[PDB]
Design a protein around this nucleic acid. Structure first.
Ligand code: ZN
Length: 260
DNA sequence: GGCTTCCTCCTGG
DNA sequence: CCAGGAGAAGCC
């Protein structure tokens, strides 16, 4: 789950939690990436004022603090009709006053449920790069940040210090749309290439948001994917069979003709 | 930055 | 029949 998927979950849950009250949480396995925060256990009758996002983190605004939720590699969020019985990987619920439930499912348990009084200060949000859809992320910034790099552009795009929300899928997809070889040294991109890359990253992410993100009710974006997970298949633009490689042991996909 | 690691569930081979 | 793949900390 990357920024589009996380953004999709935020919009899907917002109209259901905003204005409603958390009676309490139900935890059936608190051993996530980190231990579930104490304060989540103690939650009692708290109204949700807002549902926001920072990077791949969802933020529930409560009066005295914030619930920080991360989906990791296999987490998801559902608002359930009512006292629907949980499944073995349904590790955390938010029992709402409106009779609905916020149900979190996460087989690998690489997700997280954390509490912070103030968003600012430290915690997992500190040191996060700029939002890619923000004006803070642009070609001149990108160019600036690459000049000292010594490695490939593709893993660099997936580095939250440079920018947030672009994970394995949209890193490969964005470079395709920009026509940039993922093995290209980051330092070797031109200001112009940086400018186009930042532009297509926004377009690609905004597109997947619009269609509910990628499904690996599911998402409708997997069918618009140009390169990710299409090894051997013909490039939708030129037919040359899609090539697969790896960066930091994550799969990366590209078209050896459309990308240079 | 690259590699490995947490954890469980399919599946391609 | 099953090893291998499927965010980001915490090493380097
Ligand atoms: Zn092509």
């Amino acid at each position: 789950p990357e920024l589009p998927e996380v953004e999709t979950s935020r919009r899907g849950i917002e109209p259901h939690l905003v204005g409603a009250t958390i009676l309490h949480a139900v935890v059936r396995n608190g051993r996530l990436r980190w231990p579930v925060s104490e304060e989540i256990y103690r939650l009692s009758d708290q109204p949700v004022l807002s549902v926001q996002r920072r990077a791949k983190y969802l933020l529930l605004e409560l009066p005295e603090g914030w619930i920080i939720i991360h989906l990791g590699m296999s987490g998801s969020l559902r608002i359930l009709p009512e006292e629907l019985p949980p499944e073995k990987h349904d590790h955390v619920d938010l029992v709402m006053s409106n009779g609905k439930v916020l149900r979190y499912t996460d087989p690998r348990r690489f997700g997280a449920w954390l509490w912070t009084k103030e968003l600012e200060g430290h915690n997992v949000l500190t040191h996060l790069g700029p939002e890619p859809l923000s004006d803070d992320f642009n070609g001149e910034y990108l160019h600036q940040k690459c000049a000292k790099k010594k490695t490939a552009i593709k893993p660099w795009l997936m580095d939250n210090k440079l920018v947030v929300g672009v994970g394995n899928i949209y890193a490969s997809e964005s470079l395709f749309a920009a026509g940039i070889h993922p093995d290209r040294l980051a330092s070797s991109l031109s200001l112009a290439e940086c400018e186009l890359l930042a532009r297509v990253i926004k377009a690609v992410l905004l597109r997947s948001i619009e269609q509910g993100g990628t499904t690996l009710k599911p998402g409708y974006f997997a069918q618009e994917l140009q390169v990710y997970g299409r090894k051997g298949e013909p490039c939708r633009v030129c037919g040359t069979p899609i090539v697969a490689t790896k960066h930091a042991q994550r799969a990366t996909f590209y078209c050896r003709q459309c990308q240079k």
